[PDB]
Amino acid sequence: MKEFAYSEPCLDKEDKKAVLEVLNSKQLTQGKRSLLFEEALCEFLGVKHALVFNSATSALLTLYRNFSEFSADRNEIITTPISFVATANMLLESGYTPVFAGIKNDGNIDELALEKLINERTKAIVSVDYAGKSVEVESVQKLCKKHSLSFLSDSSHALGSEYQNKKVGGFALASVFSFHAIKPITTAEGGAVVTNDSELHEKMKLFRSHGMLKKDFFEGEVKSIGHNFRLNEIQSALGLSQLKKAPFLMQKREEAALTYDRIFKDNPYFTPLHPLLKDKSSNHLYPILMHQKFFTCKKLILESLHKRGILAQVHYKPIYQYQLYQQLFNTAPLKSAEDFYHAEISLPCHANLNLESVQNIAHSVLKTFESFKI
Amino acid sequence: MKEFAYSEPCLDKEDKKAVLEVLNSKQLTQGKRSLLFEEALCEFLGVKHALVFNSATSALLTLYRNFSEFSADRNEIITTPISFVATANMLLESGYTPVFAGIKNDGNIDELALEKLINERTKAIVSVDYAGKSVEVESVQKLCKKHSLSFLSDSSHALGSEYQNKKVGGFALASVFSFHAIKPITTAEGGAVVTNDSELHEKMKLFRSHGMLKKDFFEGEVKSIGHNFRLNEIQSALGLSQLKKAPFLMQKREEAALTYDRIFKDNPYFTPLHPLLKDKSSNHLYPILMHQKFFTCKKLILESLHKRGILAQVHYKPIYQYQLYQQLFNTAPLKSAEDFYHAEISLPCHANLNLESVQNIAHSVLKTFESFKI
Numbered sequence: 001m002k003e004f005a006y007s008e009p010c011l012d013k014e015d016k017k018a019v020l021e022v023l024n025s026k027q028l029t030q031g032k033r034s035l036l037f038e039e040a041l042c043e044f045l046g047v048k049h050a051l052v053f054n055s056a057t058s059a060l061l062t063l064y065r066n067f068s069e070f071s072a073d074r075n076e077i078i079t080t081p082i083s084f085v086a087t088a089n090m091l092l093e094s095g096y097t098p099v100f101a102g103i104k105n106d107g108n109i110d111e112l113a114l115e116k117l118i119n120e121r122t123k124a125i126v127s128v129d130y131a132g133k134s135v136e137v138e139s140v141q142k143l144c145k146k147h148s149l150s151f152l153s154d155s156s157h158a159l160g161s162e163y164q165n166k167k168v169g170g171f172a173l174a175s176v177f178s179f180h181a182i183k184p185i186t187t188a189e190g191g192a193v194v195t196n197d198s199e200l201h202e203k204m205k206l207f208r209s210h211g212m213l214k215k216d217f218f219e220g221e222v223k224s225i226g227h228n229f230r231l232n233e234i235q236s237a238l239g240l241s242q243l244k245k246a247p248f249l250m251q252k253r254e255e256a257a258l259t260y261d262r263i264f265k266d267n268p269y270f271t272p273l274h275p276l277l278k279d280k281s282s283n284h285l286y287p288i289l290m291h292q293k294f295f296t297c298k299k300l301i302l303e304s305l306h307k308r309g310i311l312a313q314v315h316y317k318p319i320y321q322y323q324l325y326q327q328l329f330n331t332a333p334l335k336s337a338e339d340f341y342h343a344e345i346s347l348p349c350h351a352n353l354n355l356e357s358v359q360n361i362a363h364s365v366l367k368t369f370e371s372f373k374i
Numbered sequence: 375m376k377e378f379a380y381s382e383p384c385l386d387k388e389d390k391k392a393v394l395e396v397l398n399s400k401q402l403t404q405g406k407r408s409l410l411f412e413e414a415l416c417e418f419l420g421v422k423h424a425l426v427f428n429s430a431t432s433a434l435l436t437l438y439r440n441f442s443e444f445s446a447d448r449n450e451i452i453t454t455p456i457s458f459v460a461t462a463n464m465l466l467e468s469g470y471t472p473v474f475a476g477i478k479n480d481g482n483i484d485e486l487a488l489e490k491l492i493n494e495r496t497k498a499i500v501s502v503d504y505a506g507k508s509v510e511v512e513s514v515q516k517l518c519k520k521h522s523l524s525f526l527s528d529s530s531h532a533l534g535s536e537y538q539n540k541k542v543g544g545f546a547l548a549s550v551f552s553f554h555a556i557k558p559i560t561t562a563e564g565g566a567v568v569t570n571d572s573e574l575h576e577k578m579k580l581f582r583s584h585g586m587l588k589k590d591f592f593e594g595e596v597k598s599i600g601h602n603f604r605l606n607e608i609q610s611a612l613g614l615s616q617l618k619k620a621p622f623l624m625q626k627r628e629e630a631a632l633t634y635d636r637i638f639k640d641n642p643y644f645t646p647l648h649p650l651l652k653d654k655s656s657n658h659l660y661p662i663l664m665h666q667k668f669f670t671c672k673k674l675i676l677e678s679l680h681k682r683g684i685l686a687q688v689h690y691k692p693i694y695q696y697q698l699y700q701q702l703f704n705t706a707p708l709k710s711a712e713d714f715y716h717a718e719i720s721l722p723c724h725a726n727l728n729l730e731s732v733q734n735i736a737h738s739v740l741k742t743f744e745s746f747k748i
């Protein structure tokens with residue numbers, strides 16, 4: 001064999017050490033470490049508040065449910081069809097109707113194609129930093145200010161990524177990050193909502209934990225519902241430990257990407273996105289875009305790659321194509337999204353991928369594409 | 375000092391070892407160990423299906439949401455006011471209106487006071503095994519069969535507890551368990567829904583994880599929404615390890631309880647519930663009930679206890695007393711619930727409490743009560 005998944009977790013002696021001491025403690029959850037992890041996120045991102053969750057999908061639900069109250073008259077939210085289905089499933093769960101915008105070459109939501117989709121039902125815009133590349137923040141901030149819309153950012157891919165030399169996380173009303181096993185850094189399962197809005201932070205904090213407010217050690221008060229989406233102490237210690245070396249892990253991915261770039265440069269088969277970056281990316285993904293000619297035999301290419309141990313993946317199937325979304329709003333397919341979908345392949349890319357591996361992978365990808373003459 | 379919390383987690387060399395090997399794995403989530411943990415639950419409980427979640431509150435949401443589809447005409451569910459607010463908050467989140475039944479001496483829902491609360495809107499009955507003592511299963515099973523009602527059980531307290539020499543978990547349409555830090559066994563945060571209904575297991579399974587159905591390694595299908603309430607591999611390993619010694623841990627609590635029983639026997643201040651058991655209990659709590667005379671100075675008693683290092687707690691404030699529930703349905707106070715609330719104190723009780731400690735605690739409790747003459 002010799003099989004490379006598209007991403008994998010990268011833990012070290014430190015991470016493990018960090019988890020041990022927690023197991024020695026009487027305080028396994030709702031303890032000092034999640035608070036520490038939250039503060040460390042704040043300093044890393046330069047934002048004013050941070051909340052950690054069991055998953056980013058819980059984070060998303062919490063944000064959608066709490067950034068404003070729900071009004072049946074302001075029930076539309078614009079977002080991208082190119083993202084993990086979770087971005088939209090949580091919109092549904094919060095009563096909102098997703099309105100799918102066109103995307104651009106780089107997989108990011110098309111900021112120029114947003115305004116025509118706004119009507120008096122439009123409440124918010126939910127962008128996704130695809131592969132860790134920050135969307136056109138300045139452009140969207142303004143569109144929303146102009147139309148009194150809330151700017152929400154699913155930045156699951158992008159912890160560490162920058163826009164105009166400023167870290168992603170601060171730009172939206174709130175931003176979501178993910179610490180799933182295979183994201184930039186991990187807590188096995190995990191997520192976070194950061195924001196500069198204290199009131200929002202507070203509402204979310206409660207929603208995350210039963211809506212319980214304290215009085216004394218013996219009694220509480222509940223003025224509104226909440227769940228249990230808390231991140232426990234074991235995972236928080238892991239997160240803290242992972243975050244400390246976040247820039248290091250990002251750079252490893254960056255170097256892997258540069259190696260891909262050297263070898264793919266000017267190839268006749270596909271176009272890699274990484275070279276086109278203007279700001280630092282978390283490099284959560286290393287996507288390549290096939291030329292139109294290869295579309296109709298994509299499946300065979302993926303299988304060919306998999307036969308070489310390159311467990312490639314596609315991000316993402318346009319969300320509106322899922323049976324549930326068809327069922328609910330027969331959504332007209334979007335040329336930009338459909339094209340990107342058929343074209344995109346994410347190659348193996350994570351902090352533990354060494355020089356030798358990248359080169360073997362990069363050459364196998366080329367050998368594969370060329371085998372399918374014209 | 376020398377402070378005893380009312381419960382605490384009990385990990386050992388095994389537990390830790392178990393967590394380590396997972397940290398050495400490339401598979402930190404959605405892996406072999408949660409499946410293993412799920413099977414181990416099935417054998418322990420003798421049920422046919424088990425699903426593990428990030429928390430019991432997520433488990434509860436998932437059950438409530440999926441045991442049937444929601445119909446505005448069958449929107450009422452009967453449950454107890456004596457339980458953790460989570461039991462009811464998730465009912466609200468699933469569109470249901472909680473209908474609060476009276477309880478009995480032992481804190482359990484009064485099976486004799488249930489029938490009169492049923493009308494053509496009633497959909498289900500949600501019982502709680504208070505302190506790990508099984509409710510009157512036979513009686514409820516029948517009431518539901520008779521009125522075509524779904525029997526749901528919040529058995530968070532009761533993993534290991536028995537009813538008529540059969541383990542709790544099998545008796546309802548489904549049952550929820552919790553592995554929060556201080557429950558019978560722990561995964562730091564964690565929960566489970568067990569059931570003998572495959573279709574229900576399947577719907578819940580999907581709801582737990584984005585509603586994603588597989589096609590090949592490259593594509594999925596989504597016919598209905600789902601979240602991320604998955605339990606990761608680290609916690610699953612912990613759960614597995616903990617479950618192996620579950621009966622051992624339960625017996626440790628049993629012994630602690632028996633020691634309390636010896637010393638409290640015939641005391642003139644309060645009545646402990648443990649002696650009154652008819653079946654094995656998980657002994658998640660060791661509750662004592664004060665006589666009416668002490669009610670009006672409960673607060674001072676709790677503080678007095680706390681000054682002695684006995685960090686006692688009350689389970690539970692009647693749910694309908696929470697500002698949110700008052701707000702939504704000005705619920706008339708129930709004498710049984712109100713009485714139990716004012717009376718109940720949970721004393722320290724967990725697998726790591728040794729003979730010496732229990733005796734010191736037991737005598738301190740007595741000293742405390744007697745200090746408040748008449």
Ligand SMILES: *Cc1c(COP(=O)(O)O)cnc(C)c1O
Binds near residue numbers: 057178
């Ligand atoms: C995977 C992902 C999420 C889901 O978050 P989890 O941590 O897996 O719960 C949300 N949005 C995007 C864009 C994702 O990549």
Ligand SMILES: *Cc1c(COP(=O)(O)O)cnc(C)c1O
Binds near residue numbers: 458460552
């Ligand atoms: C604690 C508890 C829950 C909530 O479970 P978590 O694991 O904390 O999410 C639900 N019901 C009862 C009876 C509980 O005691």
